[PDB]
Design an enzyme around this catalytic site. Structure first.
Site, PDB file in Angstrom:
ATOM      1  N   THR A   1       7.450   0.404  13.260  1.00  0.00           N
ATOM      2  CA  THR A   1       7.919   1.159  12.648  1.00  0.00           C
ATOM      3  C   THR A   1       7.483   2.548  12.563  1.00  0.00           C
ATOM      4  O   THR A   1       7.913   3.466  11.829  1.00  0.00           O
ATOM      5  CB  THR A   1       8.196   0.566  11.115  1.00  0.00           C
ATOM      6  OG1 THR A   1       6.724   0.710  10.606  1.00  0.00           O
ATOM      7  CG2 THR A   1       8.765  -0.687  11.006  1.00  0.00           C
TER       8      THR A   1
ATOM      9  N   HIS B   1       3.205   0.807   3.326  1.00  0.00           N
ATOM     10  CA  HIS B   1       4.094   1.905   2.790  1.00  0.00           C
ATOM     11  C   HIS B   1       4.588   1.934   1.387  1.00  0.00           C
ATOM     12  O   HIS B   1       4.751   0.887   1.078  1.00  0.00           O
ATOM     13  CB  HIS B   1       5.242   1.547   3.926  1.00  0.00           C
ATOM     14  CG  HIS B   1       4.936   1.449   5.195  1.00  0.00           C
ATOM     15  ND1 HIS B   1       4.710   2.177   6.458  1.00  0.00           N
ATOM     16  CD2 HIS B   1       4.609   0.188   6.184  1.00  0.00           C
ATOM     17  CE1 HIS B   1       4.588   1.831   7.452  1.00  0.00           C
ATOM     18  NE2 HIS B   1       4.346   0.550   7.396  1.00  0.00           N
TER      19      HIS B   1
ATOM     20  N   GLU C   1      10.078  -0.501   3.705  1.00  0.00           N
ATOM     21  CA  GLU C   1      10.837  -0.209   4.812  1.00  0.00           C
ATOM     22  C   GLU C   1      11.829  -0.963   4.993  1.00  0.00           C
ATOM     23  O   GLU C   1      13.110  -0.618   5.149  1.00  0.00           O
ATOM     24  CB  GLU C   1       9.823  -0.453   5.894  1.00  0.00           C
ATOM     25  CG  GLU C   1       8.768   0.580   5.846  1.00  0.00           C
ATOM     26  CD  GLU C   1       7.974   1.045   7.314  1.00  0.00           C
ATOM     27  OE1 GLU C   1       7.872   0.267   7.967  1.00  0.00           O
ATOM     28  OE2 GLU C   1       8.010   2.179   7.533  1.00  0.00           O
TER      29      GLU C   1
ATOM     30  N   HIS D   1       2.032  -4.621   5.419  1.00  0.00           N
ATOM     31  CA  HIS D   1       2.205  -5.369   6.951  1.00  0.00           C
ATOM     32  C   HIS D   1       0.897  -5.672   7.362  1.00  0.00           C
ATOM     33  O   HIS D   1       0.007  -4.968   7.324  1.00  0.00           O
ATOM     34  CB  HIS D   1       2.755  -4.064   7.871  1.00  0.00           C
ATOM     35  CG  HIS D   1       4.348  -3.519   7.532  1.00  0.00           C
ATOM     36  ND1 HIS D   1       4.692  -2.465   8.007  1.00  0.00           N
ATOM     37  CD2 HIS D   1       5.124  -4.282   6.916  1.00  0.00           C
ATOM     38  CE1 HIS D   1       5.762  -2.384   7.523  1.00  0.00           C
ATOM     39  NE2 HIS D   1       6.278  -3.469   6.977  1.00  0.00           N
TER      40      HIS D   1
ATOM     41  N   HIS E   1      -1.876  -2.787   6.431  1.00  0.00           N
ATOM     42  CA  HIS E   1      -1.790  -1.409   5.953  1.00  0.00           C
ATOM     43  C   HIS E   1      -0.406  -1.411   5.045  1.00  0.00           C
ATOM     44  O   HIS E   1       0.220  -2.510   5.072  1.00  0.00           O
ATOM     45  CB  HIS E   1      -1.431  -0.402   7.188  1.00  0.00           C
ATOM     46  CG  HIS E   1      -0.390  -0.543   7.918  1.00  0.00           C
ATOM     47  ND1 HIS E   1      -0.308  -1.303   9.082  1.00  0.00           N
ATOM     48  CD2 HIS E   1       1.054  -0.269   7.939  1.00  0.00           C
ATOM     49  CE1 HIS E   1       0.954  -1.389   9.642  1.00  0.00           C
ATOM     50  NE2 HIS E   1       1.812  -0.790   8.868  1.00  0.00           N
TER      51      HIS E   1
ATOM     52  N   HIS F   1      -1.320   8.614   8.305  1.00  0.00           N
ATOM     53  CA  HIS F   1       0.071   8.175   7.767  1.00  0.00           C
ATOM     54  C   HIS F   1      -0.026   6.987   7.053  1.00  0.00           C
ATOM     55  O   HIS F   1       1.088   6.686   6.283  1.00  0.00           O
ATOM     56  CB  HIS F   1       0.740   7.947   9.296  1.00  0.00           C
ATOM     57  CG  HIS F   1       0.216   6.931  10.305  1.00  0.00           C
ATOM     58  ND1 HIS F   1       0.410   5.590  10.330  1.00  0.00           N
ATOM     59  CD2 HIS F   1      -0.424   7.281  11.167  1.00  0.00           C
ATOM     60  CE1 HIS F   1      -0.271   5.315  11.094  1.00  0.00           C
ATOM     61  NE2 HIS F   1      -0.795   5.811  11.943  1.00  0.00           N
TER      62      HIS F   1
HETATM   63 ZN   LIG Z   1       3.779  -0.756   8.629  1.00  0.00          ZN
END
Ligand SMILES: [Zn+2]
Length: 258
Positions: A196, A94, A104, A117, A92, A62
């Protein structure tokens, strides 16, 4: 089936396996800059990353994550809205399929190209498993990425991504210094929220930095060549691994700055 970001297993489905998805303190949120309250009692953040020891980089199906040794107080976050000492565990990202989406959190409904993050856990709970069961267990530093100039301190990460292209691949990733990912300013917004991704635990103090870092189009392009799938399954590019903004409900966002 197992959760993800697709049409049939994406964020709108997660509540069926993780009912806290519809809870009172879910993340991310839109930060309305005119409704955020300046709180002069908020302390400056203290980021002490000089002794950080990175261990591995991993494609977990992911995102990709860099993990750190958190067995002692080496890389810690203190101050700000926090009580006590939080150890860096991992970071990590997004990101999106296009430059106009990927973050996000949003700021006055503006989406950034990606969001970094840095996940830390409260050492009073002894291990991260225990910390995720507490309302003050984790602190996540959120940093927006915009497309512009290259960020030199990110290049060591982008150059190893071809070696972790598919789900479950990992590689040694030592001597990486996370200070190279920080913006100039540490002014921030903060609010109580959640992870999240599943399990969406409501254990996070969010600290979202005002100032984005810039990355080049070539750098973000490399993110978008990763795969959600394992080796030997149909290729599905790892893009748009972000969960949309959730209702603020009974929460106030506080700002460290006027
Ligand atoms: Zn995250």
């Amino acid at each position: 089936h197992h959760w993800g970001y697709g049409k049939h297993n994406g964020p709108e489905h997660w509540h069926k396996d993780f009912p806290i998805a519809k809870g009172e303190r879910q993340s991310p949120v839109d930060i309305d800059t005119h409704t955020a309250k300046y709180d002069p009692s908020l302390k400056p953040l203290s980021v002490s990353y000089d002794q950080a020891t990175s261990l591995r980089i991993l494609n977990n199906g992911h995102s990709f994550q860099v993990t750190f040794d958190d067995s002692q107080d080496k890389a810690v976050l203190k101050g700000g809205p926090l009580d006590g000492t939080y150890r860096l565990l991992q970071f990590h990202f997004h990101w999106g399929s296009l430059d106009g989406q990927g973050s996000e959190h949003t700021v006055d409904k503006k989406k950034y190209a990606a969001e970094l993050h840095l996940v830390h856990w409260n050492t009073k709970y002894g291990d991260v498993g225990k910390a995720v069961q507490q309302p003050d267990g984790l602190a996540v530093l959120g940093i927006f990425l915009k497309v512009g100039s290259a960020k030199p301190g990110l290049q060591k990460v982008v150059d190893v991504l071809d070696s972790i292209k598919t789900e479950g691949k990992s590689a040694d990733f030592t001597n990486f210094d996370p200070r190279g990912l920080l913006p100039e300013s540490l002014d921030y917004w903060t609010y109580p929220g959640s992870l999240t991704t599943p399990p969406l635990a409501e254990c996070v103090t969010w600290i979202v930095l005002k100032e984005p870092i810039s990355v080049s189009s070539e750098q973000v392009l490399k993110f978008r060549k990763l795969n959600f799938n394992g080796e030997g399954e149909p290729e599905e590019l790892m893009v748009d691994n972000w969960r949309p903004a959730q209702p603020l409900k009974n929460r106030q966002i506080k700002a460290s700055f006027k």
